[PDB]
Amino acid sequence: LQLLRNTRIFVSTVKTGHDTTNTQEILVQDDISWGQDSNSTDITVNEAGPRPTRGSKRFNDSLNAAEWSFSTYILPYEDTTTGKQIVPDYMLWHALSSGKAIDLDGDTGAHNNATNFMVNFKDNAYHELAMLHIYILTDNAWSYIDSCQINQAEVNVDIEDIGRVTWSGNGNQLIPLDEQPFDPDALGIDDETYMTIQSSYIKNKLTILKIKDMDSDKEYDIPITGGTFTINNNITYLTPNIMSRVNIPIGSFTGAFELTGSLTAYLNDKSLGSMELYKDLVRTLKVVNRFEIALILGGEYDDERPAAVLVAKQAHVNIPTIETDDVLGTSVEFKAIPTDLDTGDEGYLGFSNKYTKTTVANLIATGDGAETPP
Amino acid sequence: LQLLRNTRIFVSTVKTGHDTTNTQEILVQDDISWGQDSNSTDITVNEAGPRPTRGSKRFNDSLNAAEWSFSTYILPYEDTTTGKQIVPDYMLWHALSSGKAIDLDGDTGAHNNATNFMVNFKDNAYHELAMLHIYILTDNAWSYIDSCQINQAEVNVDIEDIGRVTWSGNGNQLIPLDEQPFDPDALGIDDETYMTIQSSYIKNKLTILKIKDMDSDKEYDIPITGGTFTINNNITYLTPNIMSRVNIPIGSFTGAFELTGSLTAYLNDKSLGSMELYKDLVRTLKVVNRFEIALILGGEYDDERPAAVLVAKQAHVNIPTIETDDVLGTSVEFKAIPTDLDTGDEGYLGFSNKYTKTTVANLIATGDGAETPP
Amino acid sequence: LQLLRNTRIFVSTVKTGHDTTNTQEILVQDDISWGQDSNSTDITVNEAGPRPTRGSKRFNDSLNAAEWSFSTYILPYEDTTTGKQIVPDYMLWHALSSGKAIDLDGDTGAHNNATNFMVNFKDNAYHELAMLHIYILTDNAWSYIDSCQINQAEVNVDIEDIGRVTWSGNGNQLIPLDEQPFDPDALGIDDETYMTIQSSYIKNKLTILKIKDMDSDKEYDIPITGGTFTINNNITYLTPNIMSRVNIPIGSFTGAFELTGSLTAYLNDKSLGSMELYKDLVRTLKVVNRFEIALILGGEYDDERPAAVLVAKQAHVNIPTIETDDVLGTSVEFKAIPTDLDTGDEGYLGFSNKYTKTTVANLIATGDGAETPP
Amino acid sequence: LQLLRNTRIFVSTVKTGHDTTNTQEILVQDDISWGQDSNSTDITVNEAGPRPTRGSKRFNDSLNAAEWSFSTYILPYEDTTTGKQIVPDYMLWHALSSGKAIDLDGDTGAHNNATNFMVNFKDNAYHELAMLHIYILTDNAWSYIDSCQINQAEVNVDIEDIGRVTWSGNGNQLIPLDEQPFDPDALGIDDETYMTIQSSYIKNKLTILKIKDMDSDKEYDIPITGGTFTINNNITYLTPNIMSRVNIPIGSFTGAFELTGSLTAYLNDKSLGSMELYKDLVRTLKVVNRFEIALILGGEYDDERPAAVLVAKQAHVNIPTIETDDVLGTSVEFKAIPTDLDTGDEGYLGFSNKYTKTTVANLIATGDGAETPP
Amino acid sequence: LQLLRNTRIFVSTVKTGHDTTNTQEILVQDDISWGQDSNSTDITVNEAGPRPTRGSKRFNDSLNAAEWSFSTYILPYEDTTTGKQIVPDYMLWHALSSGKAIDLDGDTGAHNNATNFMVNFKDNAYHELAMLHIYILTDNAWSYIDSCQINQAEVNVDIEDIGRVTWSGNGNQLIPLDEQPFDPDALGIDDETYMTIQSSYIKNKLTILKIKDMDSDKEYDIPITGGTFTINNNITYLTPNIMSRVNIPIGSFTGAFELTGSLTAYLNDKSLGSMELYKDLVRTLKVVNRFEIALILGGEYDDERPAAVLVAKQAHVNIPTIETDDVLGTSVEFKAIPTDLDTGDEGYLGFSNKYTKTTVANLIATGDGAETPP
């Protein structure tokens, strides 16, 4: 009874009218997790007398926001309906992108064209976010998260493992369901889709890094040894306290979302190498420098190959550190910084199965490698 | 010199007149531990001048309460003298039971009859407790703990390991002894006793759980995957501070003693199963529910078999949690709650080598399975 | 003194009242083995000083479960008392079948009728098993195993050697006996029985295999080159650790028993041949397929002939492998899988001296080839 | 049906357009091997209750990389088309040489001229390698390995046996074929070729060794007793884990390829003999020495004779060992070391049917014995 | 060149002033072995980039302790100079006996008198041992081990083969020598010595065993089927790690030396036979029993005959085991145990060419069979 991965996961914008447009099934890894916790309070009495007592009574106070998390592979493929690049989980990317309706052609948040899929953060600064719903399925059992919201996404550029993304978020409540709400197989993925998928994996070790200085126009060639980057949202949940009858969270505040990254490499002695960058950074000692950072997951080729691209137009670089690893490991940490307070952040995320270096240049320049850049 | 387990342990009510009635030897496991610590204080001076100095002098301040702990197996057997069930370590059970004299027939605290041994907490709420003495013996060496008091007892219902109990407590001081105080072998256990013992072990995996709702009279069948329960006392030690000549603890306060427990199981889809209980608990959301909990260590049979029983007449159940184990592990936590402030707690602990299911029903109903229950 | 095979073996349900009903002598092969081992622990001291020392003292800790094993031929014959097929060693088959009393007519576990002998696993899932006793006899000497339990049985379908079974198990202790406990010859086999036996051997090379697909209703004809199958129980022994006076095992846990098998053949190019099965299995790549497997040890005939039958109603087949043997050897591995968690496994084992193909069909269909199948 | 060596082996760069230029048949020895394996996972449940259960279900997880291996003789002969030395299996030598297109005249990787055939490792450091295809043929049956890559090559310089090479590699999958893909005889070898071949065998026992010190310019004469050398690649295969529907390897990483060797001899007392080398090596104790090593398989002559040559320009020699063989056997182990991290390794491998000592000197000096060395 | 056994072996206390008193030649068997090994470490780099590399450089790290071992026959004979029994290899026996100077009359370690040669372990517990030197000689070549120390000695009491001892040890370094250091023939054995030797061999099959119980004063007669015993030292070598210039061992720690033994026999049914001992040992189950064990290699006679004696005054016997050999083989294992931590071990080893049973009794009683025992 109740085998582990017989669970299946669906995400929906609304709780009724499920179809291939408002609902989507997503592939999941092994370590999927979800749960819901409650607060407790112990009260006891202490007395100075001849006949000491105990009596103590704890009471349930309230419910914490239900937690959920999983991981999935990066997976671009062409939709036969529109002839455009798309990923199975693009609903959640839109949810993280903005708190308004889906429009994959309006260029805001998440969008696509015949060549590639792009994600930006132009219209995300809200007090709330696009409210979604997560449905979990087991053998003859259903459950779902009410009013789930995404909080944190992380990507680890490993040297050996396949590229993946890890997602975590919270919701108001976890509730089981009495019956089957919608078709488990009609709205799911299909065999020919997965046949196209089997060629869309990212060959992780080919990932390449590019750096450019915004002060002296200097550039460096930096071989790398893996790293990470992370987008956060700092969600918070509000809760009134009528503890005489238990309380439930009523809403959420979207704090300041964040984008950070970290890189590792060897200290290399070469022209415009890691040694030169390290010396420049040490001698600089400026309060605020500016740099442009490009990560090409899967590498790049003159031909059409699968790849993903992370772009930072204004990232400020911290002072690097040297470790005692076997061969002189070096580490660098960087943050996203928008130009002035209210303007857009780095934003540009790109994914496709057919990037070429020329298209990569356009994608870096404008956030879209398809059309002619200025 | 000084082989490890050549240590032997005795417990006595008084320091003189040792015999089989006021002293008892108990079997011990490998990980027995004991020790005594002291406090220290460092004083130093800092000066703003041309000739900086150091001088610093630490002083011994006081002694902390000596700590001791060990573990032993649950072990019921019939005493040939009285024809009643008894355990070798029933002195310490009485000590935890009440702060007054031993009476195994007064039904208060610890008692027994021809069928089984029972322990209750009717008369334990004191500012102190029954003061005992622990003697430790090594090859040609003796030591003892002055005014030891029990604090914490824990029982782990494991799926595979034999049932055991772990005991920890404190005392005023640890003092070595110059000579042999009392006979090491005359007051110890004997061979025929241990021959009877070898059949008194508890076959742990047979342990069974029963739950009953006090609101809707509902009951559930819950297969389990091990768990724990714990009794605490929250002892505290008082100490005046004449640090010009070192200090020693002078007495103890018995805080609020406690009884808690935790259980684990699989999410099972069956009538009155774990799924039904989980749904009821989630939908309930009441501040204070009430339940009756029965643990039968060793299981039960219509025939006479060795077993132990833990009874909770009023335990309140917390909201259960679901883990990401290989097959949908679920966890439940519960506490003992007395009816109103000053009345007796759950209390009922039962042990014997010959429980039957009919006797188990009476034991659950009244705390004694021998006589006719109402 | 003490010639080797002058040993004789008896098995009994109880230690007293030995007769032809509760005790049975079984034929044994040459390689019979039995023994009992003990654990040891070495303690030593290391010191940093000018006068280094040695002293080290090992102590006996406990006894491991006594091991025993042997082998015997498959041997069906008709009992003149009941007019039903029976095997000399059917006590141990019942012991492996269930942990309750013998009933060769209740159809549970092991049973028989006027035509054949059957064994099933309907009522075997216990924490323990039917506790038996093994007596070994040598010239003027007796010994016995206390509380022996069967663990593992293996059958090797060889191309040339006679069919045989190999049995291994464990017990609490091995104990010699001071005198002759029961008649060595009155309860043993008799000459006329063995005269009937001499015709009951299995002509091993005639063994045949049948396979049926549960998805496409497909069947194949597979000539074979020998193989094996094995039933396991994963017994475990529990032992408290009072090492100051040596310990002895007190009980056993029956783990998950198991049924597995392996087959070998040549890659044959024929309609519904091994090549076709190999291609189907390679192209399938399904997570869980289902198949029905029939082994007929001794082959089958339209006439009455001696044979044994192994039936797997739901066996899942692993991906076969190809070896570099002289002519393209191929290997297949399979496991027993019950329908859902708690239901009965494959179970059906059949033995007789007079199987016919029509009776074989009924035996495959229902587990009993005597009565009319549905 | 299906006789053993009626198998024939072909290697192709592409799956279509088979001819004498993109496909080649190679001679094989007896012990050719190939296979493909799959992973399995067993899940079971353990419960503490009165009605213990079993149910366990294994699931197929994924496929391991298909393994293949064989051996063949070293075989140089002159091609009538180009008038240059060539070996039948030079496709696989090119595959091991580099991951780019064939060019037997560009001097990179594998090349040749009118005198001899050479192999180098100048352009092999890639993340992948030249992807080839292996076709295996049996009587009325075809199979092939998809995306096979070479991993390991070994050569054993035996005293008595003919020189041979052993090759092992892996591929994505093993797939049978429904029909005959290409002509089995038109693209194979021809009779006159084999008539030329019968004179191209290497008389193994004539193999000679030369050693030169790079520190003191010292040289030694070392009679040898056989040995080995090995080239490795440390290939690795990547595999996503969607185990709800089985997985297949998607790509490979080329690790660090390697070249090592080992030699054996007698301890000989002579000027510049093995004794002198042993004494020098023992007294040296330097961290990194440098040596030049030459192996001439088949020996050398002033006349034109068949031979092969292994050259190590920078090999570092480990400390030799002495064995207890009948006459004072001694063993030496050596590794290839490039000058600095990124430069070319030893590389130089030479093969021909007409080496002369003067040509051997040029081959040692430059890696090509045909043109005038500097 | 360099014939195998033309090697000769000498042992010396010091490296200069070689004579018949500080140097001795010993007979050796065929399988003599010696060698010296070194450690290696491989370092490699892995990079995630477009132009992957290899470069790897191993470095020599340090030298392990040189190993050496051989075997020789037990060989007592009378020295004409002192008129006392002596063995050719008594230097190494003294070395194993103690770490101080030789004194064959001080009764400590190794000593002798006019009747026999004795070895004890009274003064051996040191951090080091008597440092010796081993010289190996071949045709026109010399080598030696620097600071060799004995570690392990083994004796196999075989039924058919002549008695022998096997010795193994380690040293700091193995170094060849440029010239002849000392006379190879003047310090060696002489012809008349070997003429006396030819009568000093031990007729192995006559070896006898005696056992006595230290609890009930019981004794048994045990015919035996061979066995072994072993003395160990657990030497360890220390080594600093300056790997930038290679390291060499600088010293050794003598761990806990050890004495163990194992015996085999048939299960014999006789008064005080092996059956009785087996029953007593099985029923005993005591943690620590005590026994006295006597091995007489070569047997004993009322007349003067060559023999050796091993004495264990306090050996503790493990639980014996029964094997499936052709006739009921039984095995027993025993260890040496000193009385309390720091006192002397069994120690008593005796050798002579003229033991008599009466002298054997005295040797067992006191460790010396010559003088009058108490």
GROMACS .gro file of N, CA and C in nm, chain A residues 1-2 4 32-34 38 40 42 49-60 63 174 176-178 244-246, chain B residues 125-127 257-258 267-269 278-279 285-288 316 318-319 322 324-328 335 337-338 341-342 345:
model
  174
    1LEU      N    1   0.082  -0.121   0.000
    1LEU     CA    2   0.000   0.000   0.000
    1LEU      C    3   0.085   0.126   0.000
    2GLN      N    4   0.049   0.220  -0.088
    2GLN     CA    5   0.107   0.354  -0.090
    2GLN      C    6   0.257   0.350  -0.121
    4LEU      N    7   0.608   0.468  -0.290
    4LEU     CA    8   0.659   0.604  -0.273
    4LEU      C    9   0.637   0.690  -0.397
   32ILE      N   10   1.129   1.477  -0.315
   32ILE     CA   11   1.016   1.567  -0.297
   32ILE      C   12   0.970   1.562  -0.152
   33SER      N   13   0.934   1.678  -0.097
   33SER     CA   14   0.896   1.687   0.043
   33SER      C   15   0.781   1.785   0.058
   34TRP      N   16   0.696   1.759   0.157
   34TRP     CA   17   0.587   1.849   0.190
   34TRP      C   18   0.539   1.815   0.330
   38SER      N   19   0.228   2.273   1.345
   38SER     CA   20   0.143   2.349   1.436
   38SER      C   21   0.223   2.392   1.558
   40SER      N   22   0.258   2.494   1.971
   40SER     CA   23   0.210   2.446   2.100
   40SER      C   24   0.264   2.536   2.210
   42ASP      N   25   0.299   2.543   2.650
   42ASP     CA   26   0.288   2.475   2.778
   42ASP      C   27   0.273   2.579   2.889
   49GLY      N   28   0.429   2.602   4.910
   49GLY     CA   29   0.341   2.552   5.012
   49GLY      C   30   0.382   2.415   5.061
   50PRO      N   31   0.299   2.352   5.145
   50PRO     CA   32   0.334   2.219   5.196
   50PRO      C   33   0.286   2.106   5.107
   51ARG      N   34   0.198   2.131   5.011
   51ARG     CA   35   0.136   2.024   4.933
   51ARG      C   36   0.156   2.062   4.787
   52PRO      N   37   0.277   2.044   4.733
   52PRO     CA   38   0.306   2.094   4.599
   52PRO      C   39   0.232   2.015   4.492
   53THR      N   40   0.205   2.082   4.380
   53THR     CA   41   0.123   2.026   4.275
   53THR      C   42   0.195   2.029   4.140
   54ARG      N   43   0.125   1.978   4.038
   54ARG     CA   44   0.173   1.977   3.900
   54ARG      C   45   0.090   2.058   3.803
   55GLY      N   46  -0.044   2.044   3.808
   55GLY     CA   47  -0.127   2.046   3.689
   55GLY      C   48  -0.081   2.142   3.580
   56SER      N   49  -0.068   2.086   3.460
   56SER     CA   50  -0.024   2.161   3.343
   56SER      C   51  -0.108   2.117   3.224
   57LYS      N   52  -0.142   2.214   3.139
   57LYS     CA   53  -0.230   2.191   3.026
   57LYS      C   54  -0.175   2.265   2.905
   58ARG      N   55  -0.132   2.192   2.802
   58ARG     CA   56  -0.097   2.261   2.679
   58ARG      C   57  -0.218   2.272   2.588
   59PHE      N   58  -0.217   2.376   2.505
   59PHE     CA   59  -0.325   2.405   2.413
   59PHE      C   60  -0.266   2.427   2.275
   60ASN      N   61  -0.334   2.377   2.172
   60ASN     CA   62  -0.295   2.409   2.036
   60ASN      C   63  -0.319   2.557   2.010
   63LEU      N   64  -0.158   2.715   1.322
   63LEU     CA   65  -0.088   2.637   1.221
   63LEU      C   66   0.014   2.724   1.149
  174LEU      N   67  -0.260   2.232   0.404
  174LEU     CA   68  -0.254   2.104   0.334
  174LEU      C   69  -0.384   2.030   0.360
  176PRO      N   70  -0.640   1.697   0.239
  176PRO     CA   71  -0.670   1.580   0.156
  176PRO      C   72  -0.804   1.596   0.085
  177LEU      N   73  -0.822   1.517  -0.020
  177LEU     CA   74  -0.942   1.523  -0.101
  177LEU      C   75  -1.010   1.386  -0.102
  178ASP      N   76  -1.143   1.389  -0.101
  178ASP     CA   77  -1.222   1.267  -0.089
  178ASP      C   78  -1.225   1.184  -0.217
  244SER      N   79  -0.805   3.093   2.178
  244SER     CA   80  -0.910   3.020   2.245
  244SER      C   81  -0.982   2.926   2.150
  245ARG      N   82  -0.958   2.939   2.020
  245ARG     CA   83  -1.017   2.850   1.922
  245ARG      C   84  -0.926   2.817   1.805
  246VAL      N   85  -0.794   2.827   1.820
  246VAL     CA   86  -0.695   2.794   1.718
  246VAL      C   87  -0.702   2.895   1.604
  499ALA      N   88   0.360   1.383   4.464
  499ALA     CA   89   0.380   1.527   4.455
  499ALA      C   90   0.435   1.579   4.588
  500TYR      N   91   0.568   1.583   4.596
  500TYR     CA   92   0.639   1.632   4.714
  500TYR      C   93   0.740   1.737   4.672
  501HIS      N   94   0.798   1.805   4.771
  501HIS     CA   95   0.912   1.891   4.746
  501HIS      C   96   1.042   1.813   4.739
  631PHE      N   97   0.722   1.690   3.757
  631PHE     CA   98   0.754   1.569   3.684
  631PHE      C   99   0.661   1.561   3.563
  632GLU      N  100   0.696   1.477   3.467
  632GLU     CA  101   0.632   1.481   3.336
  632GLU      C  102   0.625   1.341   3.276
  641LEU      N  103   0.123   0.535   0.694
  641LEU     CA  104  -0.010   0.578   0.653
  641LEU      C  105  -0.081   0.461   0.586
  642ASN      N  106  -0.179   0.403   0.656
  642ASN     CA  107  -0.247   0.284   0.608
  642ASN      C  108  -0.389   0.319   0.567
  643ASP      N  109  -0.429   0.271   0.450
  643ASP     CA  110  -0.565   0.291   0.399
  643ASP      C  111  -0.649   0.171   0.438
  652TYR      N  112  -0.583   1.025   1.078
  652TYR     CA  113  -0.518   1.146   1.030
  652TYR      C  114  -0.622   1.246   0.979
  653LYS      N  115  -0.719   1.198   0.901
  653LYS     CA  116  -0.824   1.287   0.851
  653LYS      C  117  -0.904   1.346   0.965
  659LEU      N  118  -0.931   2.015   1.460
  659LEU     CA  119  -0.881   2.149   1.492
  659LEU      C  120  -0.931   2.198   1.628
  660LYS      N  121  -0.978   2.107   1.713
  660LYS     CA  122  -1.022   2.146   1.846
  660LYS      C  123  -0.901   2.177   1.934
  661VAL      N  124  -0.923   2.265   2.031
  661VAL     CA  125  -0.813   2.304   2.120
  661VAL      C  126  -0.772   2.187   2.208
  662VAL      N  127  -0.868   2.119   2.269
  662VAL     CA  128  -0.838   2.010   2.361
  662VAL      C  129  -0.925   1.889   2.331
  690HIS      N  130  -0.385   1.379   2.555
  690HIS     CA  131  -0.423   1.464   2.444
  690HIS      C  132  -0.323   1.449   2.330
  692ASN      N  133  -0.143   1.549   1.976
  692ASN     CA  134  -0.106   1.662   1.891
  692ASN      C  135  -0.133   1.630   1.745
  693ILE      N  136  -0.117   1.731   1.661
  693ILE     CA  137  -0.140   1.714   1.517
  693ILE      C  138  -0.028   1.629   1.458
  696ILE      N  139   0.380   1.410   0.862
  696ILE     CA  140   0.414   1.316   0.757
  696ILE      C  141   0.557   1.343   0.712
  698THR      N  142   0.920   1.220   0.476
  698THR     CA  143   0.958   1.177   0.342
  698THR      C  144   1.032   1.044   0.342
  699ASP      N  145   1.003   0.956   0.438
  699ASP     CA  146   1.068   0.826   0.442
  699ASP      C  147   1.029   0.744   0.319
  700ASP      N  148   1.088   0.626   0.309
  700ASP     CA  149   1.070   0.543   0.190
  700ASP      C  150   0.923   0.511   0.168
  701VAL      N  151   0.849   0.475   0.273
  701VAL     CA  152   0.704   0.457   0.259
  701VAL      C  153   0.630   0.541   0.362
  702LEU      N  154   0.603   0.668   0.326
  702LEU     CA  155   0.503   0.754   0.391
  702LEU      C  156   0.497   0.736   0.543
  709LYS      N  157   0.087   1.363   2.525
  709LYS     CA  158   0.125   1.403   2.660
  709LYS      C  159   0.023   1.347   2.757
  711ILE      N  160  -0.227   1.411   3.064
  711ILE     CA  161  -0.304   1.522   3.120
  711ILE      C  162  -0.395   1.471   3.230
  712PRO      N  163  -0.379   1.517   3.353
  712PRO     CA  164  -0.470   1.476   3.460
  712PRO      C  165  -0.603   1.548   3.448
  715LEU      N  166  -0.649   2.009   3.797
  715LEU     CA  167  -0.511   2.039   3.835
  715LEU      C  168  -0.450   1.934   3.927
  716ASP      N  169  -0.518   1.901   4.036
  716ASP     CA  170  -0.454   1.832   4.148
  716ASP      C  171  -0.472   1.680   4.146
  719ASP      N  172  -0.243   1.147   3.773
  719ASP     CA  173  -0.211   1.142   3.631
  719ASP      C  174  -0.245   1.003   3.576
   0.00000   0.00000   0.00000
